[PDB]
Design a protein around this nucleic acid. Structure first.
Lengths: 52, 52, 185, 148, 51, 37
RNA sequence: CACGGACCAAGGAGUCUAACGUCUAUGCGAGUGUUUGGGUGUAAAACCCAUACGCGUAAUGAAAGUGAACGUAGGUUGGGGCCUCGCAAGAGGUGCACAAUCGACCGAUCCUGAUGUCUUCGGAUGGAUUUGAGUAAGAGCAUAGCUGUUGGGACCCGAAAG
């Protein structure tokens, strides 16, 4: 009936792993109103660097 | 005329004899070649002494 | 006694010789061990540690992958190194002259490379023309392009495939795959 | 090879790799895909989701010969030609005569669009075609001759 | 460049007419699969047994 | 045999995809259109 | 102060198969598989082989059905290695695989609904916090081996019963 004895040990054997952040994370939850404009902005910057 | 060669193809359909993976079997002729021995470092002491 | 931080007597999870018994691979191992020991180059070491690999971690590199590699800025006259197999690609129609070095060529890949003036080389002639790793371009094929990785991490909302044999509209499309029948997952 | 199996390495060890507390008993868990919505539910809902339900409608007496539409893209079209002649059709075809390709004899029922081709006129005989795959052929200089 | 091998007679004498080595003999000599093949090809002439 | 290997091209003004896409539709709508009369 | 076991010999218990997963070895490689069958034979072997078939090369949808390049097959960040300069440290360029990310393409769903049109057919175009076991210079097929899985007498012996 719910002993928690020997769970922390089992966790710490193979360790408690931090999530390993990245650069450029996901944009699934952000304001779509901002998502669209970002999509239009980056193409413009790509084009402006395609020349210069 | 059975197994074929570089010149004449086999009576066997769609059969070329297997291609080698290495050219020569005497690796020492490769090792003791001027291209290699003019590019490796100098050796020393197949078996070396017991310091301390 | 000793309070231990590390698992004791733990092998390094790498392999340091091929599980194969191809004597003509033992020889190239004998060779690149030498050229990795008695040299200050890492190309030799990379090739050594690549010869040990299994058939899925040592995949085929298409002749078009090659042609794309030679299209890079300045890589147009290098000599190319595949430590696997080099497979033809009929989707192309213009192949350069170059020099490819690899273990096994297929008979179409040899012929295209030869019809375009090039030559197909083994990794023993390449160590003669290039011990310290000169003008070389190492290529690797794709590993995640398999029918088996398609199922790894299979679970909910991961977007992966099930291990399955027969496909259709009756086979794993009903419940847990739409909102009408139960729920979606 | 039985000399290579782990039944040999377990001679001596009572409880031959199947345990002491809980043993190798005789079908615990049911026989088969049983308990798929009772006690194996959170496997069948994790690893095989889509089991347990009807979807779509029934086609009594399906013959899989009606639904013979193998695809080809515009990459293997020049593989259908024999290797000895596509040489002298590629560099050639600055002439008027154009190679003709019978995909139905190649074993194909539709041609598709994936990829590119050279600006070399062909004639392509097939019973089904995609829009992009006609657009590319006409652009090259060719034409499509529906058959059957 | 292909080497020659000389034709012997029934009396033991070597003739003059010598012959080029085929390409089979330059082929790779791979004991791994001459063995992997033999362990499966020496099984084909078997007769069943049972009780 | 079938037609001659390596003959000439007659790129006329038609579209094969559209032809098929229409032959499907007239086969579909023959019976409803003959009821329209 | 729980069970079996008086002693000895011999026998005695995770196997075989069908279909499969991961992993490894091998052959060939956008193909692969000879062996249902035929030819052949020193005769259940070995050797040779057409045509089809299977798996794979194209998915998606309940289905009709449609069906994968705006781009030096994209950009950004990292990335081994290679090249360049350097006494070296380092700087730059190139950057396969791989990982994160924004996009482009195919199909499905929702929306927009053009040229024309048997006047209701057709559906170009541009979109969408939607969706897919997808595309994006292919990676698989066959055999074999350990482990593992399901059904099979199924590790060996065992019921009351029907």
């Amino acid at each position: 009936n719910h002993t928690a004895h020997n769970q922390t040990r089992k966790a710490h054997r193979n360790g408690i792993k931090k999530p390993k952040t990245y650069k450029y994370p996901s944009l699934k939850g952000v304001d779509p109103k901002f998502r669209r404009n970002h999509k239009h902005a980056l193409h413009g910057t790509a084009k402006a660097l395609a020349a210069a | 005329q059975v197994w074929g060669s570089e010149t004449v193809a086999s009576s066997k359909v769609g059969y070329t004899l297997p291609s080698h993976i290495i050219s020569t079997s005497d690796v020492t002729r490769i090792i003791n070649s001027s291209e290699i021995q003019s590019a490796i470092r100098p050796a020393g002491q197949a078996t070396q002494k017991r310091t301390h | 006694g000793i309070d231990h931080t590390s698992k004791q007597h733990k092998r390094s999870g790498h392999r340091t010789a091929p599980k194969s018994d191809n004597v003509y691979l033992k020889l190239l191992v004998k060779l690149y061990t030498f050229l990795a020991r008695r040299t200050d180059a890492p190309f030799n070491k990379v090739v050594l540690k690549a010869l040990f690999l299994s058939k899925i971690n040592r995949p085929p590199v298409s002749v078009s992958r090659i042609a794309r590699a030679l299209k890079q800025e300045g890589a147009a006259n290098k000599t190319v190194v595949v430590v696997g197999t080099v497979t033809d690609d009929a989707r192309i129609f213009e192949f350069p002259k170059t020099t490819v070095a690899a273990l096994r060529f297929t008979a179409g890949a040899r012929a295209k490379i030869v019809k375009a003036g090039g030559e197909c080389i083994t990794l023993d002639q390449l160590a003669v023309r290039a011990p310290k790793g000169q003008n070389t371009l190492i290529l690797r094929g794709p590993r995640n392009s398999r029918e088996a990785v398609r199922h790894f991490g299979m679970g909910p909302h991961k977007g992966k495939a099930p291990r399955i044999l027969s496909t259709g509209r009756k086979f794993e499309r009903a419940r847990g795959r739409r909102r009408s029948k139960g729920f979606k997952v | 090879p039985s000399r290579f199996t782990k039944t040999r390495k377990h001679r001596g060890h009572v409880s031959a790799g199947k345990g002491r507390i809980g043993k190798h008993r005789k079908h615990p868990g049911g026989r088969g895909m049983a308990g798929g919505q009772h006690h194996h539910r959170i496997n069948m809902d994790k690893y095989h989701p889509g089991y347990f339900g009807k979807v779509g409608m029934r086609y009594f007496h399906k013959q899989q010969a009606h639904f013979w539409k193998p695809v080809l893209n515009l990459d293997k079209l020049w593989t259908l030609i024999p290797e000895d002649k596509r040489d002298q059709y590629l560099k050639s075809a600055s002439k008027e005569t154009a190679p003709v390709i019978d995909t139905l004899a190649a074993g194909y029922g539709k041609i598709l669009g994936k990829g590119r081709i050279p600006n070399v006129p062909v004639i392509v005989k097939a019973r089904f075609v995609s829009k992009l795959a006609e657009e590319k052929i006409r652009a090259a200089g060719g034409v499509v001759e529906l058959i059957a | 460049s292909r080497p020659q091998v000389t034709v012997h007679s029934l009396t033991g004498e070597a003739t003059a007419n010598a012959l080029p080595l085929p390409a089979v003999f330059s082929a790779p000599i791979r004991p791994d699969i001459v063995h992997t093949v033999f362990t499966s090809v020496n099984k084909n002439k078997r007769q069943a047994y049972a009780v | 045999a079938t037609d001659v290997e390596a003959r000439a091209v007659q790129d006329n003004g038609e579209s094969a995809f559209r032809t098929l896409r229409l032959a499907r539709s007239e086969k579909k709508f023959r019976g409803i259109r003959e009821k329209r009369a």
